[PDB]
Design an enzyme around this catalytic site. Structure first.
Site, PDB file in Angstrom:
ATOM      1  N   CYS E  85       0.812  -1.208   0.000  1.00 14.96           N
ATOM      2  CA  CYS E  85       0.000   0.000   0.000  1.00 14.96           C
ATOM      3  C   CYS E  85       0.849   1.263   0.000  1.00 14.96           C
ATOM      4  O   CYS E  85       0.294   2.364  -0.071  1.00 14.96           O
ATOM      5  CB  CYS E  85      -0.947   0.000   1.200  1.00 14.96           C
ATOM      6  SG  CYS E  85      -1.491  -1.618   1.760  1.00 14.96           S
ATOM      7  N   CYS E 206     -13.543  -0.352   7.804  1.00 11.58           N
ATOM      8  CA  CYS E 206     -12.594  -0.828   6.809  1.00 11.58           C
ATOM      9  C   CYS E 206     -12.713  -0.035   5.517  1.00 11.58           C
ATOM     10  O   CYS E 206     -13.816   0.287   5.068  1.00 11.58           O
ATOM     11  CB  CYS E 206     -12.822  -2.307   6.508  1.00 11.58           C
ATOM     12  SG  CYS E 206     -12.791  -3.340   7.935  1.00 11.58           S
ATOM     13  N   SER E 207     -11.566   0.261   4.918  1.00 12.33           N
ATOM     14  CA  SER E 207     -11.551   0.874   3.610  1.00 12.33           C
ATOM     15  C   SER E 207     -11.953  -0.148   2.550  1.00 12.33           C
ATOM     16  O   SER E 207     -11.719  -1.347   2.713  1.00 12.33           O
ATOM     17  CB  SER E 207     -10.171   1.418   3.287  1.00 12.33           C
ATOM     18  OG  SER E 207      -9.218   0.373   3.257  1.00 12.33           O
ATOM     19  N   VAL E 209     -12.267  -1.954  -1.445  1.00  9.66           N
ATOM     20  CA  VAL E 209     -11.466  -2.232  -2.632  1.00  9.66           C
ATOM     21  C   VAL E 209     -11.802  -1.199  -3.694  1.00  9.66           C
ATOM     22  O   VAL E 209     -12.976  -0.971  -4.006  1.00  9.66           O
ATOM     23  CB  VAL E 209     -11.710  -3.663  -3.133  1.00  9.66           C
ATOM     24  CG1 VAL E 209     -11.546  -4.640  -1.990  1.00  9.66           C
ATOM     25  CG2 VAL E 209     -13.077  -3.813  -3.756  1.00  9.66           C
ATOM     26  N   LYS E 329     -10.601   5.450   4.072  1.00 11.00           N
ATOM     27  CA  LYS E 329     -11.892   4.813   4.301  1.00 11.00           C
ATOM     28  C   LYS E 329     -12.978   5.430   3.434  1.00 11.00           C
ATOM     29  O   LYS E 329     -13.746   4.716   2.782  1.00 11.00           O
ATOM     30  CB  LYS E 329     -12.265   4.906   5.781  1.00 11.00           C
ATOM     31  CG  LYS E 329     -13.744   4.681   6.093  1.00 11.00           C
ATOM     32  CD  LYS E 329     -14.266   3.350   5.550  1.00 11.00           C
ATOM     33  CE  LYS E 329     -15.765   3.229   5.749  1.00 11.00           C
ATOM     34  NZ  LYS E 329     -16.414   2.252   4.829  1.00 11.00           N
ATOM     35  N   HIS E 333      -9.310   3.698  -1.388  1.00 10.24           N
ATOM     36  CA  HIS E 333      -7.945   3.214  -1.179  1.00 10.24           C
ATOM     37  C   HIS E 333      -7.530   2.368  -2.378  1.00 10.24           C
ATOM     38  O   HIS E 333      -7.519   1.142  -2.303  1.00 10.24           O
ATOM     39  CB  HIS E 333      -7.856   2.435   0.147  1.00 10.24           C
ATOM     40  CG  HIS E 333      -6.505   1.872   0.433  1.00 10.24           C
ATOM     41  ND1 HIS E 333      -5.370   2.355  -0.173  1.00 10.24           N
ATOM     42  CD2 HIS E 333      -6.097   0.906   1.293  1.00 10.24           C
ATOM     43  CE1 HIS E 333      -4.322   1.685   0.268  1.00 10.24           C
ATOM     44  NE2 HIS E 333      -4.734   0.804   1.162  1.00 10.24           N
TER      45      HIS E 333
END
Ligand SMILES: [Cl-]
Ligand SMILES: [Cl-]
Ligand SMILES: [Cl-]
Ligand SMILES: [K+]
Ligand SMILES: [K+]
Ligand SMILES: [K+]
Ligand SMILES: [K+]
Ligand SMILES: [K+]
Ligand code: NA
Ligand SMILES: [Zn+2]
Ligand SMILES: [Zn+2]
Lengths: 392, 347, 128, 347, 389, 128
Positions: E85, E206-207, E209, E329, E333
């Site tokens: 990342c 959670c971020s 996809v 988030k 991302h």
């Protein structure tokens, strides 16, 4: 803009290393390079790593963190650089540019590959081609370079015997190299009669799948003097890079690698020398034809004449009036661990120009004191050239 | 008011002779050739399937129609071997000819009558004015069970027909259509099984002939015709013997039925059988020729058609490959290569 | 799965792009003209599937999926409009040579195992 | 000119709540109910299948039409779960309603749009005068893969529609139809596999919404209408969420879309989904009500319809069971008995 | 050793972009960056690209050649840099060092990711963890950061409400961002009651996809005046990077990212400023907890206190402004592009660009910092920008 | 496949390394001691499978393969010898807490589809 030099080189054996893990490999190469350079682990300011496969062989990305962690050098920055089979040379060029910038004084440039752990290596090596427009249709990586040989044979009249002589020389040179994957003599007939992979190529024209790791320590030309004697320091006169279409079908002429011509010309210009001054050259000969083409693109002979040069053996060490090509055996005979090859290519020039005992049995004649390396990604989409000299 | 504006066919290049199958299974090839009236059959390349065959036939039909595929308002593919269990062939064919997106489509199933079911559907939509042109395809890559008698005839091929409303564009005109349908368990396949099962000699009189002859008698009664009114005929052809028995029963002569019979050198292409036979008739027919076409599918049912050929036929026949040319461009293979291609080797 | 859908019109129908500014046809279609870059204006362009063999090879030991086809011909075809493509050729291995005129054909290129999606696209057939 | 003379529906009696599936697989039922807008689904008895469901629905439609099934000239069954791989459901249904032998038939495949594809075929055959009445059925006994999210929605049901030409007998009239079709690999199943595969989040915007919304806008352009011109609407309903998102995007209110939405208590019956929703609308609609109906199938494709209700609707609604009555006559089961019935237990 | 500046920034929308291909994305970002910087295609001397997925999303390695080829910039050198990342920031740092060296004057640093083309993205995001000793045993990437959150809660008493406020703020901020993946407001209850992924985290922690691409044009500080007005130039005061153990279990302390402390400290030294002087910060908050930890490790508050300072929401005039764009988030991302986007936001914020008009932070000092993290902390790259050279 | 074979002794038997120079036990075994690097001399070391929960999480939506286990406990165990490992815990969801003593167990960790190889390794079980 500081001048950059090489102070140490380390290498594992290239081949089917079942015992040695991917982590275990890069360490062995790093320690050898550290020892050769007479530096401590703490002296390394940054690392640049090449690996093409990464997540295709093991499912592991973020190899930089892994390598720095398991080498024990945390918190030094580690960075992965990728350009398929050219990842090694790109890692070096990244390392060189980081020294030249003044942000780091001592940097390790290394490459590692563990191709034996995958069931079928083909899919990984095919990553260097266009997945949607080459691989999808069933163009295997050997078949792409075979179509280059076919067109080169069509335009310039290269015969299969002339192509096969490249493989004979490579293997002879590899018997003088302890780290080579193949240490056996061959003949023209054995090369031509070997099992075919992709017409006109045979198994004896294609480089094998290899595990291995190699590492260089690059350093500021002035700081180099504290770790090494002024002898045995080799200076990087030029570190150039170019690009070409990723797909072979998009090339304007498939018989040449424009990115090599562009990169090599730029290197010759910066080093203020001509191709005639190169004593030893390391070219990317994963399928032999690629060796002939690069010999032309680097300017050692006219387009279409590479075959004539190889048949007479001018590239051989023993031959005195011409540049010496792949003294180690090249990718075909010495082995082709994708990520480490670009590093290894340069490590051989380092030994050859410094008259190290590692290449004593394959020592090329050095009239001028210059060596050049050409590392190719895939079919030519990326080329990186490094020009070395014994003189700063 | 309703007719065929264009038609096209496709057959793959590989063939296998009865001798190569009989050799392996220990049977007398001459007895089979004479019993079934079959010499060889077609075999698709391993990179060929019902979808590719349908595209070939559809594209050829577009050439003959000489129209813009964008005008096609329906694409129907009838088969027994749709490459997917759940994903429509017809959509892939529509995309591959440029008919998308302003159209409807569906994949048809009804054993070997699926293909002709689509013709009737296109007839309805065009006649009703709901679409300007509709395409009906019948194609299959049949697979016979190794060792069974169907392995001598189960072949690959397909044909496409484009239906339209405009006299100037019609190469043939529908005079009428009729269908006979019952619930008959002569031939079937369950979702799990690789190859079908059948009732042996129940497949003959109570099923094929019952439905083929009732359908043929039905349309002639609907149309007020006799066997003497028709120039050509084509019936379903699971083997050469059933075809000829049916043709002679109704009173057709060799000259009337000869063109529609392809199985002896093509095999039984299932939902492509009658469409292909009809297409060979059209490659030979002359203005004014009247055709009787009757298909058959197990479950069971038959579709009958009464068609008259127009003057435009000669303009289009050469605009695409002729069914006899496709059938005669061929390469023979032995049983080992055949089961390799067809995916019959457990791997 | 999604990647096949994005290139279906190119693989099925050989529909590429023509840059109005310089006129060069591009196949596969390109988002940007390499010669004019930002000044290039791209239009939709339908190619004929006709071309000639520019170079080729014969694949003798391919991945396991291609076992039925082995040995198969792979080639780079120069299409009449200009672009070159990489594709297989449906002919015997002793009938392929540079310059042979060929024609595109809708064929089954790949399949994602027994459960996955079937992928169709162009394969070239010699024409007599 | 063309309309519905009768329609009928069927839903089996067993249900299973989301709570019972999630309990086994360790999921939050409240999250699922809210995420999908689904509470429970239908379950066929182990002695029930698409054919039996199709027969129930077909027989009910005959009651409402009030006609003699012998006059039906075509029977089309659209499904994903035809009891045979090769033997037509449609033939069994025709035999079971007395429509045989003077008719054509075919089994239709195009994911969840198969059912509505058949309606368009009947419209054509009736409009062209090739038949007097045609029947189009959409029915399924869907099976969701154990552990996957489709197991919460995969249900059984079906509905039949008889199409006719006689104004005195029409309960509703087709004003127009339009279809949007492309090649989209959002959802598929290969012949060998037990359960389908899909592209997850690709099933939404680029597939369902693309096709459902393009089909809706298209027919409204064809008809020169706006959302306000319609009294009721029904879209494909793989879950409640997709339905409501689509309906709200186009500008429909709850009063307009409420009747067509059955999935929250029925589940997704695939090719029977829109046919069933449409039938619930017709059980409630009054003379003059105008309906927008748009199906969706993976593949992909959608069939849109613009329908107006006539005064005859109230004569026939009570001539057969109402879809809401069928939906509420229910017996609950747990996951063990559910997988027993559905054949989800290995042996 | 030359000073390096930023003369242009370009970005695609971040989200589920089905129609846009991998190629279509990087081009859109590159052309936007070129156009903003007022440079020609030929003026680019080299490119540096970040893309973690590469061959796991599409099977394509050798992305550098592909991107240069299809951008039309052959034969310019193009190089891929990978650190999970953190690939985006790493490509920037590589570009910076190449300008500083004198070998290149104008260099494009971009990142791109195409995560929607795979059926299951988890396997790729799990690549950033140790495959043999974390993934193998069933530790999903969200479960690792959840174990960090659990340990942080155990040591410092962070409550789920405090953690959840991070996500409320992010989404509020993202409504002002045109390029954000999520443009809707949320509440504490909606966050806490969302479906759980890995205790204690929920789907709203959670971020997602994401597909997207972003690109920067970096240039020599002196030549920069040739393409841009002296007003719209932002200078890169520091580009630092550090390393930590790849596996969470090998960390000396799981509640902090040593590589962030090392890198941020080094950046502050080179720029000769303190954390108190940062006006805007862009931190790596793929799972919220990671945002809290980085706010501490960059020195904006004491270890263990991040939960308390965020609950007050410190619109707030006297405290640093964190993730004005919505962070990972809410804004999205796209692994390879995030590190680039982070900096592009600081560039906009410091140059008072229209793009961030509706989310403009107060700039008393003229400094911004970005922290980009690879995996659970094995790699951290920090960039410190200023309006002053 | 080959990578499982290399780490079988660690995953099955928890055999790590102890550095003589500083005495630190390492598991998983390391080729180089991070604290002593070259001057570290590593020896084979057998760990007891005993440890305590250092941190944990509960995985509610894992990949499809784990469908039978879902929801499962994942944790980092601090072994008595010093090292920490990541592993699943065979306990009920409401029984996991930091500091709980646990013990390693030979279990089936994963399987490479229907055709591929089965991989075994450690899973932790609480004590009493
Ligand atoms: Cl050391
Ligand atoms: Cl059938
Ligand atoms: Cl430009
Ligand atoms: K050349
Ligand atoms: K089927
Ligand atoms: K159309
Ligand atoms: K009419
Ligand atoms: K600007
Ligand atoms: Na020589
Ligand atoms: Zn142009
Ligand atoms: Zn030690």
């Amino acid at each position: 803009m500081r001048d950059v030099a090489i102070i140490g080189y380390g290498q594992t054996k290239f081949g089917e290393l079942w015992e040695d893990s991917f982590r275990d490999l890069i360490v062995e190469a790093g320690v050898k390079a550290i020892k050769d350079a007479n530096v401590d682990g703490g002296d390394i300011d940054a690392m640049y790593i090449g690996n093409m496969s990464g997540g295709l062989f093991v499912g592991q990305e973020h190899i930089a963190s892994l390598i720095a962690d398991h080498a024990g050098l945390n918190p030094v920055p580690c960075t992965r650089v990728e350009a398929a089979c050219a990842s090694g040379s790109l890692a070096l060029r990244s390392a060189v540019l980081s020294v030249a910038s003044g942000h780091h004084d001592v940097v390790l440039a290394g490459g590692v590959e563990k191709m034996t752990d995958v069931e079928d290596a083909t899919a990984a090596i095919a990553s260097a081609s266009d997945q949607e427009w080459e691989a999808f249709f069933g163009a295997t990586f050997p078949s792409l370079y075979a179509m280059m040989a076919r067109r080169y044979m069509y335009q310039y009249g290269l015969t299969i015997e002339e192509l096969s002589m490249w493989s004979v020389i490579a293997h002879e040179n590899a018997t003088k190299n302890k780290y080579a994957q193949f240490g056996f003599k061959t003949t023209l007939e054995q090369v031509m009669n070997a099992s075919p992979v992709a017409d006109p190529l045979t198994l004896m024209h294609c480089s094998p799948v290899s595990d291995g790791a190699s590492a260089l320590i690059v350093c500021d030309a002035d700081k180099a003097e504290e770790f090494a004697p002024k002898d045995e320091i080799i200076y990087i006169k030029a570190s150039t890079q170019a690009s070409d279409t990723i797909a072979l079908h998009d090339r304007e002429d498939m018989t040449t690698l424009n990115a090599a011509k562009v990169a090599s010309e730029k290197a010759y210009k910066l080093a203020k020398i001509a191709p005639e001054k190169i004593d030893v050259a390391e070219v990317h000969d994963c399928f032999a034809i690629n060796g002939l083409i690069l010999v032309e693109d680097l300017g050692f002979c006219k387009k279409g004449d590479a075959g004539k040069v190889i048949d007479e053996g001018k590239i051989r060490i023993d031959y005195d009036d011409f540049v010496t090509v792949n003294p180690s055996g090249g990718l075909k005979a010495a082995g082709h661990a994708l990520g480490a090859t670009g590093i290894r290519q340069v490590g051989e020039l380092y030994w050859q120009l410094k008259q190290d005992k590692e290449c004593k049995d394959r020592q090329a004649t050095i009239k001028n004191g210059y060596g050049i390396a050409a590392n190719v990604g895939g079919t030519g989409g990326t080329v990186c050239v490094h020009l070395l000299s014994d003189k700063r | 008011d309703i007719g065929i504006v264009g038609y096209g066919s496709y057959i793959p290049k590989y063939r296998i002779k009865v001798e190569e199958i009989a050799k392996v299974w220990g049977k007398d090839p001459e007895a089979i050739k004479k019993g079934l009236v079959v010499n060889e059959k077609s075999v698709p390349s391993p990179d060929e399937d019902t979808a590719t065959i349908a595209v070939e036939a559809a594209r050829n039909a577009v050439k003959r129609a000489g129209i813009n595929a964008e005008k096609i308002g329906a694409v129907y593919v009838g088969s027994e071997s749709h490459p997917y269990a759940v994903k429509p062939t017809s959509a892939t064919v529509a995309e591959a000819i440029g008919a998308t997106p302003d159209l409807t489509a569906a994949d048809l199933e009804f054993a070997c009558k699926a293909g002709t079911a689509g013709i009737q559907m296109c007839m309805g939509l065009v006649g009703s004015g709901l679409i300007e042109y509709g395409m009906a395809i019948g194609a299959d890559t049949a697979q016979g069970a190794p060792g069974d008698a169907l392995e001598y005839t189960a072949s690959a091929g397909g044909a496409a027909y484009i239906i339209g409303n405009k006299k100037d564009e019609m190469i043939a005109v529908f005079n009428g259509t009729y269908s006979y349908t019952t619930d008959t368990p002569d031939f079937w396949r369950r979702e799990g099984q690789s190859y079908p099962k059948h009732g042996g000699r129940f497949t003959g009189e109570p099923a094929y002939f019952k439905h083929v002859l009732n359908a043929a008698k039905g349309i002639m009664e609907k149309m007020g015709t006799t066997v003497k009114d028709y120039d050509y005929c084509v019936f379903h052809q699971p083997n050469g013997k059933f075809y000829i028995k049916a043709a002679k029963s109704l009173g057709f002569t060799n000259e009337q039925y000869k063109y529609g019979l392809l199985t002896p050198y093509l095999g039984n292409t299932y939902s492509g059988a009658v469409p292909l036979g009809l297409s060979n008739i059209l490659d030979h027919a002359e203005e004014g020729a009247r055709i009787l076409a009757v298909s058959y599918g197990s479950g069971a049912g038959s579709d009958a058609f009464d068609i008259t050929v127009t003057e435009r036929i000669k303009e289009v026949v050469d605009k695409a490959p002729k069914t006899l040319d496709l059938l005669n461009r061929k390469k023979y293979i032995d049983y080992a290569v055949y089961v390799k291609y067809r995916g019959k080797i457990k791997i | 799965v999604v990647r096949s859908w994005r290139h279906m019109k190119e693989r099925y129908n050989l529909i590429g792009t023509r840059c109005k500014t310089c006129g060069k046809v591009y196949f596969p279609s390109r988002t940007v003209c390499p010669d004019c870059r930002r000044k290039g204006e791209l239009e939709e362009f339908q190619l004929s599937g006709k071309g000639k063999i520019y170079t080729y090879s014969i694949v003798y030991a391919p991945p396991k999926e291609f076992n039925k086809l082995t040995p198969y011909v792979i080639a780079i075809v120069e299409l009449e409009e200009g672009p070159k493509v990489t594709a297989q050729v449906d002919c015997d291995i002793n009938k392929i040579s540079i310059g042979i005129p060929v024609e595109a054909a809708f064929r089954r290129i790949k399949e994602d195992g027994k459960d996955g999606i079937i992928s169709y696209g162009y394969k070239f057939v010699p024409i007599t």
